[PDB]
Design a protein around this ligand. Structure first.
Ligand SMILES: CCC(CC)Nc1cc(C(=O)O)ccc1N1C(=O)CCC1(CO)CO
Ligand SMILES: CCC(CC)Nc1cc(C(=O)O)ccc1N1C(=O)CCC1(CO)CO
Ligand SMILES: CCC(CC)Nc1cc(C(=O)O)ccc1N1C(=O)CCC1(CO)CO
Ligand SMILES: CCC(CC)Nc1cc(C(=O)O)ccc1N1C(=O)CCC1(CO)CO
Ligand SMILES: CC(=O)N[C@@H]1[C@@H](O)[C@H](O)[C@@H](CO)O[C@H]1O
Ligand SMILES: CC(=O)N[C@@H]1[C@@H](O)[C@H](O)[C@@H](CO)O[C@H]1O
Ligand SMILES: CC(=O)N[C@@H]1[C@@H](O)[C@H](O)[C@@H](CO)O[C@H]1O
Ligand SMILES: CC(=O)N[C@@H]1[C@@H](O)[C@H](O)[C@@H](CO)O[C@H]1O
Ligand SMILES: [Ca+2]
Ligand SMILES: [Ca+2]
Ligand SMILES: [Ca+2]
Ligand SMILES: [Ca+2]
Ligand SMILES: [Ca+2]
Ligand SMILES: [Ca+2]
Ligand SMILES: [Ca+2]
Ligand SMILES: [Ca+2]
Lengths: 390, 390, 390, 390
């Protein structure tokens, strides 16, 4: 019985640096001989012995003949696949875990838990897979696209928590939390506080007692709903992030939202999933966030940090920490994950870099990686080097 | 000595849902760079640690230059191959186990048993392989295409049973059962009861004492010969399925076969292999069957269930349980298999979706998967997304 | 310390049957997307847990641009490669072990021993590799193409024996035997008896004390030099095969060589490597041989058996045992090997089927497999299904 | 806790022989179906159970559409990748470890340590990765292209040493040494003696106490700076090689540098990384070096040996030991590494054979291998067999 995974102390360090870049389409030339899968919503989750790179493929490759439709986000073809982090995710290299147009996964220290969501928009369903066996499901409660995180779920002592949501993109979307153990939902948690619209939550362990999430409100505020979840009482409350450094996109100039922490401000219809990871020290807590550069578009991506404090009531702007991607490169979904070293955990931030070339061609994405290593300051940015005409 | 496999209690659940789809030809475009094998008669078998996807390749790929002949079912080129369930079965990814134009396989908890059938139609022969070593054979007794199940054989406490048949497709085809242990036939069983024509049996454990099979009669009835095999006395009897929900194809309207359970009705020359799996509860028994939608063609596929009762003498129609495939998609051979979770077994139903485009092109198939997970009702159907012009 | 390999009793059986066929060029169409290596002199060797398929690649693939030269047998590019038996030997799937234009290998029960031969014709050299480390060599003693078996070397209790030869193809070629242990030559054996010309020896264990070989004399007789090697006294003697069923090619009509066992007869310049394997019973000894059909060309291949007796002095023709390949298909080098089952050994015969299309195109080969399984008679032959115009 | 790696006694032997050649571009024809990565600066490092082949890919393949730029040595795309020695390094077969335009790696007996260098020329940074986790960094001290060895770092009892350098290529480049343990720099060593310009050091264990390196001075002498590093006192001193057999390239005729050991002679602006490995005997020490044939260009490569003596003060020319590559083939970077046999170490010499075809096409390299095996003399040379027009 390989003991259960538990959050540890982060490894010593004080800055992020360019780590690894998976640009599969650097090999999809019409004149090349490779078959890189067409995907989106990628993310990484790590176990005690290995890190896996997950994504939602449109079940097609480049070069191929099924580019039309790769732009849509839901259909009966999309599948959750994954490869060892470091391997190019190609047709042959990939493992198709289950059909889904929305997913997540995490390793409890013994086995992998794979979460996938598919079905009709009005009654979609969450499927849970533990290793090889399909073991449970969950139904749409708001009957409007049951969806999940698009990032690693979190496990502790055997219990894994996962945020799911149901509702209109431009309306009410009260999220919920699932407490999964060995593949089956053993509890349903209903969040408290600001619950109007919450989704695509990037969660992580702030400690052995609390799991925190930075999320996405898609129709009311440029501020990010921030979840705090007590693992001991299994209760969860939500409140908007008080910092003037709005992490969502689009958004207005920093600090331009008048009023107290809780004020939503202009709707700024839409948003984006943002990265977020913890830096657990003995008596301090680093909270790293990522956010696109352009205030209105998905271009560039910068790193931000803020040690200690209550994100719920601290308006002091975040400390800029570096340019992971320039505004000349695409910066879409970002997520956080943690690599497990011999005696400590290593926080990282992934960055989906979408190759959007329009509706009349393929639509895929690279994945850029930045982790905590050493001191000083972020030294280098990331590019995809991909030309969509090849 | 990794203990022997034994049938367990099915995992809690009350409905089937779209699980996984392996559509290898979504990657065989003339403009792509993949090499998906051309196959047919696919099926899945699982061991304690992994599930493998088997099939009969025509030893050619798409795109290739050997499409002519992929339509025929027997020749000196066909081979039994397999890959980990989840991997696209391609030239590089596949393992060729042995030459055969008819096969089956199962895992006894220690090693894999591979069964293949090849040779001349008038004197074909069954080859048994245990892991790496070829260990035994069996000769044609009716000298007319010795053939096997095309689905997982079943093992218990070390002994594996397998149905084989010999005879005319439109005549007598008395099937037999082989009791294999560690690679060698240790017993031959002769069925009792209705034995005129029985084949392509989909078998599974109804319990530790009985192995049941839903089979195919190809020249007399649209009803399905149903086998019951006692593992303790090693005797087996056959009788036709009494339900008015005829599972074969072609077939007439349900309940239209006048007379008692045993009446054959019109010949309805031909048939098809059908899916069938068990749902073992503490004091109840679920029996799941699949059958094409069109009464005369291989289009669409619906799921059916029926708890308890004696299929041999119960005429009450089956309970429709969902549309796994629409009549607009192809639905050919279906089979059943079971995934092994930590403490219980998970029943599933595979569906070969053949890409028939005529005699002047390639002929291959995808494999759609549906397993028992959660409650409610089957929510979504499966498509292949493959265009045979690419 | 995983105990050393020792010859065991063959598994029960009384006939050979078509087992497996590796036709890599069924995937090398100019219109396909595969990269099967161009090779020759293939063979199989098995360990306790797996069988590997070895060959000498010309370091090129089909389709490619380096076909010119694939016809020559020696150069600075040829390499010894291998894959798990069952996997198509392609660029990606293969493992290049060492450069060589002549080779062999065997598993002592702990590690693999790889033998390769390269260098100039006048001073070639034998390289020995044990697992990952290169550990020893052997120099040309007759300074005229030091060459080896082209088939599995044989190991026992830790000591592996290997036949090597040096000399003119149409002249003297006194072979020698190397006794290798853990990668290093611990002894050199000089054969006794008829030693004029001996090579490409197919060796195997007739028992724990004797290793026997059927070989190739290339310039004097159509008869096959037969080696007997005592493992206890580490001495070896050679004498020509006395049977009237000449195994070499070319050769004259059977029994047409007048005189006693030892008479050479007409030169019949040239020859071919032939298959040969043992069937060890409790008190009997089966000796299986293969030989092409055409008396003058490499077309077709039939199986022959002969239980007990002394091949050195028995002129009774061999018992025809079946047509493994028809005279319409190519039949080149054949070899023997043994698969290791749980409690007994399973003898097999490999058949290199060369796709010779001339000097102005590629030149590669498939590998056909036949093993001992069941009773009755060899039922089916093997074809390559490959068209050299694609 | 798999014990730590320690230098052992070399395996018995007295000469080098052609071992293995990895020519990935023998498969990159425009008409082939393979995808071999475009790389440079390859090298090998071995652990107790396996040897890995590392290199710096330009994140492109042949055939591809990203050839422009493959000539430059630094950019945000270059990555450190590796495959099991014996496998062709292709898109699918390779593992991308981390982004870098300069690297090294070594196995401490438990885990792999990967070193990579990227960032801006004026402030580049060294990243250390231990297995899966990124664990430490090191900053540029001379702010001018922080670079590393391009060959296996060396570990002992758990502590790994690595040479790094910072400075102008045609000026001062005082190198430094890092003492890494379990992924983190636990010490910084400043060399003593001739420290004007030292880089691309090829290091190895001369004994349990000393690690020696043959390096590259790029702007002052054709002589090779030779490092001696005491592992017990963790101090290191440098002095130029005194032999008249200048190992650098370009260089003047041997022995033409007038003066004592320390004299630099004409600048001979430029240089090259050279191979160097040890042959540890009980009471003798073999030191093997490689150097291109042409005195001014990177063509051909010969092996040299010299037992015992102090390279710092011995002017006796080295003993020519063979032609590994002819002056008609390209001979670029050469390095040394050691394979670990059951009870002794086996020294080898790698040779990067660059396919330079100009600035208007691709630029990649094969890797030729020669190891210590047997006695006599190096018998055969190596060719790439690659035609850059295909
Ligand atoms: C409808 C809700 C919306 C977020 C506010 N979801 C969403 C947004 C984008 C995007 O803004 O680019 C891309 C994909 C999705 N997804 C879907 O449409 C199904 C679930 C998934 C997965 O693809 C992630 O939420
Ligand atoms: C001749 C008997 C008939 C079933 C009544 N078999 C059969 C039917 C079909 C089909 O109806 O599409 C496809 C393949 C076969 N098979 C053969 O011809 C050889 C054995 C195998 C395997 O391919 C399965 O029975
Ligand atoms: C010169 C001796 C001759 C056998 C009598 N060898 C030989 C014959 C053939 C053939 O007759 O088709 C093919 C290859 C070889 N080989 C060589 O030329 C080098 C060694 C090897 C390996 O290829 C096997 O002996
Ligand atoms: C600028 C210093 C110079 C050596 C004197 N480096 C160097 C030389 C060559 C070559 O002479 O062909 C190729 C690559 C490099 N490298 C770089 O430019 C970055 C580091 C690396 C790796 O590619 C190795 O030193
Ligand atoms: C962040 C943190 O302190 N996590 C703790 C870890 O230190 C401890 O070893 C473990 C025991 O379950 O619980 C967790
Ligand atoms: C369906 C069923 O009950 N199967 C039984 C299982 O419960 C039991 O543990 C095992 C012991 O051999 O035998 C089988
Ligand atoms: C052919 C034969 O009998 N081989 C014997 C085997 O039976 C025995 O178990 C072993 C012990 O070393 O030696 C070998
Ligand atoms: C070159 C050399 O002698 N290396 C020694 C080795 O012999 C010894 O077994 C080991 C113990 O740590 O230390 C190292
Ligand atoms: Ca592949
Ligand atoms: Ca928003
Ligand atoms: Ca491949
Ligand atoms: Ca019927
Ligand atoms: Ca591949
Ligand atoms: Ca002859
Ligand atoms: Ca591949
Ligand atoms: Ca120099």
């Amino acid at each position: 019985e390989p003991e259960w995974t538990y959050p540890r102390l982060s490894c010593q360090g004080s800055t992020f640096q360019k780590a690894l870049l998976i640009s599969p389409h650097r090999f999809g030339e019409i004149k090349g001989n490779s078959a890189p899968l067409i995907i989106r919503e990628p993310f990484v989750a790590c176990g005690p012995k290995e890190c896996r790179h997950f994504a939602l493929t449109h079940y097609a490759a480049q070069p191929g003949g099924y580019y039309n439709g790769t732009r849509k986000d839901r259909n009966k073809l999309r599948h959750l696949v994954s490869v060892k982090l470091g391997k190019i995710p190609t047709v042959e290299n990939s493992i198709f875990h289950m059909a889904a147009w929305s997913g997540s996964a995490c390793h409890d220290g013994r086995e992998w838990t794979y979460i996938g969501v598919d079905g009709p928009d009005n009654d979609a369903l969450v499927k849970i897979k533990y290793g090889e066996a399909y073991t449970d499901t969950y139904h749409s409660y708001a009957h409007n696209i049951l969806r999940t995180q698009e990032s690693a779920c979190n496990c502790i002592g055997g219990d894994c928590y996962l945020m799911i949501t149901d509702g209109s993109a431009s309306g009410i979307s009260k999220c919920r939390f699932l407490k999964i153990r060995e593949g089956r939902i053993i509890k349903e948690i209903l969040p408290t506080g600001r619950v109007e619209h919450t989704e695509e939550c990037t969660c992580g362990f702030a400690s052995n007692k609390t799991i925190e999430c930075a999320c996405r409100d898609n129709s009311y505020t440029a501020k990010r709903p921030f979840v705090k979840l007590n693992v001991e009482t299994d209760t969860a409350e939500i409140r908007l992030m008080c910092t003037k450094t709005y992490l969502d996109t689009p958004r207005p100039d920093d600090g331009s939202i008048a009023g107290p922490c809780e004020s939503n401000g202009d709707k700024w219809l839409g948003g984006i999933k943002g990265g977020f990871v913890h830096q657990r020290m003995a008596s301090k807590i680093g909270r790293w966030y990522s956010r696109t550069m352009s205030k209105t578009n998905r271009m560039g991506m910068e790193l931000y940090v803020r040690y200690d404090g209550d994100p719920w009531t601290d308006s002091d702007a975040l400390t800029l920490s570096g340019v992971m991607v320039s505004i000349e490169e695409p910066g879409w979904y970002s997520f956080g994950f943690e690599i497990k070293d011999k005696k400590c955990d290593v926080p990282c931030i992934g960055i989906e870099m979408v190759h959007d070339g329009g509706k009349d061609t393929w639509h895929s994405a690279a994945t850029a990686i930045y982790c905590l290593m050493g001191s000083g300051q972020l030294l280098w940015d990331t590019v995809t080097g991909v030309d969509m005409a090849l």
